Amino acid sequence: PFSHTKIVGPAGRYGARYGMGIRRKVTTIEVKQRGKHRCPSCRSLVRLERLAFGIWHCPKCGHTFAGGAYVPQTILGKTIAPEELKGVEAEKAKWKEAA
């Protein structure tokens, strides 16, 4: 399931140190952290750059926004997003509510 390892994935940089449980928590987080996400602005499936924990940048449209420490959007953060970015859903609802 990984490029050269079966389960350790990104935590392979730790070798046999720190314990299975610790390296497993790291792998669970970093698979999402270093994977591809959707830009909140341009909706492109791109690998966003984390400038620092909580700061994310889109290399396609230049959108720089505040997010989670390790993922661009936390579970609770998703429900209280700015509505200048939920323009697709406002138009989708209206289109269903008009035709």
Partner 1 sequence: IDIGRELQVAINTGKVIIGLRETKKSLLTGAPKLVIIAANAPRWAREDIEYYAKLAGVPIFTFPGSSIELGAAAKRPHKIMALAVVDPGQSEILKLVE
Partner 2 sequence: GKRILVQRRGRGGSQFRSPSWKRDGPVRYPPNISGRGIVVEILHEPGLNAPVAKIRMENGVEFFNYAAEGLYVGQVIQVGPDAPPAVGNVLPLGKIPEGTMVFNVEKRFGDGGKFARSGGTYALVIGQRPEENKTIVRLPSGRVIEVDARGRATIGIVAGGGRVEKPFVKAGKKYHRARAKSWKYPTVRGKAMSPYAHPHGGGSHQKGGTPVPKTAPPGQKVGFIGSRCTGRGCVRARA
Partner 3 sequence: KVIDVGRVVVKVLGREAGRKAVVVDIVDENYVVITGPKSLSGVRRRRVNINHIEPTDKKIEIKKGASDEEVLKALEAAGLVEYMKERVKPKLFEITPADVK
Partner RNA sequence: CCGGUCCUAAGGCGGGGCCUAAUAGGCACCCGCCGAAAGGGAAACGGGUUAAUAUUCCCGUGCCGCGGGGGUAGGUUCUGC
Partner RNA sequence: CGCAGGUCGCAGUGGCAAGGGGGACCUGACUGUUUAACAAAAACAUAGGUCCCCGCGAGCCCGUAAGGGUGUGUACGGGGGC
Q: Of partner 2, RNA, Zn ion, none, which one does residue 97 interact with (CB within 5 to 8 Å by kind)? A: none
Tokens (6 digits) for 67: 């997010």
Residue of the chain from 31, 63, 71, 85 that contacts partner 3 (CB under 8 A): 63
Choose one: 3-11, 26-34, 46-54, 62-70; the region binding partner 3 (CB under 8 A).
Answer: 62-70
CB of 62 to partner 3, least distance (A): 4
Residue of the chain from 7, 18, 64, 87 that contacts RNA (CB under 7 A): 18
What letter would DSSP give residue 2? -
The residue (of 22 and 81) whose beta carbon lies closer to RNA is 22
**Concatenated DSSP letters of 21-69:** HHHHHHHHHHHHHSS-EE-TTT--EE--EEEETTEEE-TTT--EEE--S
State whether residue 71 is helix, strand or coil. coil
